[PDB]
Structure 1
Amino acid sequence: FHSFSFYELKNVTNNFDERPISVGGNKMGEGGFGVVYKGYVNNTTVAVKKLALKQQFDQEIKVMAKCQHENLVELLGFSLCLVYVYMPNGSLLDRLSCLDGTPPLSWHMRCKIAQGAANGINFLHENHHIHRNIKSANILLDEAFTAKISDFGLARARIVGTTAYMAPEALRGEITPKSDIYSFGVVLLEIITGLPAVDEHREPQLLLDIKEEIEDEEKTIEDYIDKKMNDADSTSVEAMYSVASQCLHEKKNKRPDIKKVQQLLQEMTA
């Protein structure tokens, strides 16, 4: 890694200009733990996450020091700010919602993204880490649309997480990689549907609840498939939905482990 002065990071982000990119500012995204800014270090674009907590900073540095992998975003350095390699296609959330005029993700691309994200999770679990905040806002996309996991402030070798992605045992305070599998199930539903994980104005508010609707025949998988893609065949969509459903089991021991999820996602496109 490398040290950055706060002076430099202030300068390369137009003094942390919080206006969105689309207004001419530097803000690319925000969450409960900080704001992510576009920075220009000489000829290079970087992503600068400014936190807004110290233990999360230290923890993210720790985990990122220990965990480097092709489906994890690379941390360039630190200042509280964290500096990362810029991911030009932004977050999976932003692409699923077609923000900033981008075209919809194809089904083929969505499948490869699911596989890449699963590969990142597998690396984490092989190395005895739990992410604890898997969600579509934290899956970034490079120029090839390769999926890379970020946001490691909550990672682990005080109950905290993103409510709409949290397994019941995680909500109760258990620490297990099986909770990451559950969260990934919600991401798979986002990939299939193009809908957000929670929407207060929607029935059901939580996306994870469409599993129950489908099982009860109040809705079907077809009712929920993203209408904006045109290369999505029923067999593979139902295969992905099957993986998602399995990941969303209420009981941790009944969920597939990440290697099984990888197998199923491979067989989906095989």
Structure 2
Amino acid sequence: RFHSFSFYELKNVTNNFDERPISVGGNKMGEGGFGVVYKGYVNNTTVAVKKLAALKQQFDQEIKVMAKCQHENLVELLGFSSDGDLCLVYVYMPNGSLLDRLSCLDGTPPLSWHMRCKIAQGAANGINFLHENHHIHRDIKSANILLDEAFTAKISDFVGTTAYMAPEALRGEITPKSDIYSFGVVLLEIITGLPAVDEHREPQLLLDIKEEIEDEEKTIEDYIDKKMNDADSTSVEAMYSVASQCLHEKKNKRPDIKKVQQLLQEMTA
């Protein structure tokens, strides 16, 4: 069940929706339009308030999905306001996204291998919940994986992103198997610490490194994030194997999200 929020209840708590960045002490921490995400504090809980701008029934279906969607590995919707803009209230995730932490943004220490494994397993569980409930994320990426106080993975969503998209998704297909492909790219980011796309890099797309390893021009060890001291070759190769299978160009020969969960658990066992 959701809590009843007034627009003026949220306007007040976001400091009149302060549009200064949070780095300077303001309340705006996202321009992920359509809509703006502000930092707030309601019900003795830090929150992320999404003020939708110029679209109404997406505000509805986003509630329709987040109402039934309550899982340990998803973001949590606290409520909303339909008063005279429209806003949604999410619980704030202090540790930001997996992208920010993989790149060690703002000086945060590198995630360990063990922490990376757990986050991968968590992301799979959240994705599995979406698939079990016949939902397609369509925008699976490290920037959409948020982390809490305990660094547990939380699938979120602020078409898709080209560096993460499957061939069929690039051709218009809408399938859960496209999410499995996107997740495979994410699994490579976790292993390598590299962004999915780097304009000034060879290859420009992280998914291409799969080729250099298959044609034995490179090995997996050459690409492993050096910002780790606890990464053993066995489990790293295990996660790469899973990422390889997810990145099969033929959607029918990719594993389902359930097999991924299984393979990621056998990895740490």
How far apart, in 2, do the equivalents of 1:190 and 1:54 lie?
35
Deviations 1:201-238 (A, max 9, x none): 22222111111122223332122211111100111011
How far apart, in 2, do the equivalents of 1:32 and 1:198 lie?
22
Paired positions, count:
263
Unaligned runs of 5+ in 2: none
Residue 6 of structure 2 aligns with which residue? 5
How far apart, in 1, do the equivalents of 2:169 and 2:126 lie?
20
Whether contact under 8 Å (2:45, 2:91) holds in the other structure is no
- Tell me the C-alpha RMSD between the 2 structures: 1.9
Q: Are the structure 2 counterparts of residues 253 and 165 from structure 1 closer, same or farther at C-alpha, using a change threshold of 3 Å? A: same
Whether contact under 8 Å (2:163, 2:196) holds in the other structure is yes
> 259-268 or 209-218, which moves further after superposition?
209-218
Correspondence 1:1-270 to 2 at 5 A: 1-31=2-32, 33-41=34-42, 43-51=44-52, 53-78=55-80, 80-151=86-157, 160-270=159-269
Identity of aligned residues (%): 99
Displacement of 1:174: 1.4
How far apart, in 2, do the equivalents of 1:221 and 1:102 lie?
25
> 120-129 or 9-18, which moves further after superposition?
9-18
> 142-151 or 12-21, which moves further after superposition?
12-21
Displacement of 1:91: 1.0
Displacement of 1:35: 3.9
Deviations 1:41-74 (A, max 9, x none): 2632101223474443222111112221111111
Displacement of 1:99: 1.4
Q: Are the structure 2 counterparts of residues 98 and 30 from structure 1 closer, same or farther at C-alpha, using a change threshold of 3 Å? A: farther
Deviations 1:86-122 (A, max 9, x none): 1121111111111122211110010000001101111
Q: Are the structure 2 counterparts of residues 206 and 59 from structure 1 closer, same or farther at C-alpha, using a change threshold of 3 Å? A: farther
Question: Aligned with 1:161: secondary structure?
Answer: coil
Whether contact under 8 Å (1:95, 1:104) holds in the other structure is yes
Unaligned runs of 5+ in 1: 153-159
Displacement of 1:163: 1.6
Question: Aligned with 1:39: secondary structure?
Answer: strand
How far apart, in 2, do the equivalents of 1:24 and 1:265 lie?
40
Whether contact under 8 Å (1:106, 1:230) holds in the other structure is yes
> 14-23 or 101-110, which moves further after superposition?
14-23
Deviations 1:105-156 (A, max 9, x none): 110010000001101111111121111111111111111111111117xxxx
Of structures 1 and 2, the larger Rg is shown by: 2
Question: Aligned with 1:164: secondary structure?
Answer: coil
Alignment TM-score, normalising by the size of structure 2: 0.90
Q: Are the structure 2 counterparts of residues 263 and 89 from structure 1 closer, same or farther at C-alpha, using a change threshold of 3 Å? A: same
Question: Aligned with 1:47: secondary structure?
Answer: strand
Question: Aligned with 1:163: secondary structure?
Answer: coil
Alignment TM-score, normalising by the size of structure 1: 0.90
Whether contact under 8 Å (1:60, 1:151) holds in the other structure is no
Question: Aligned with 1:188: secondary structure?
Answer: helix
How far apart, in 2, do the equivalents of 1:257 and 1:53 lie?
32
Q: Are the structure 2 counterparts of residues 145 and 162 from structure 1 closer, same or farther at C-alpha, using a change threshold of 3 Å? A: same
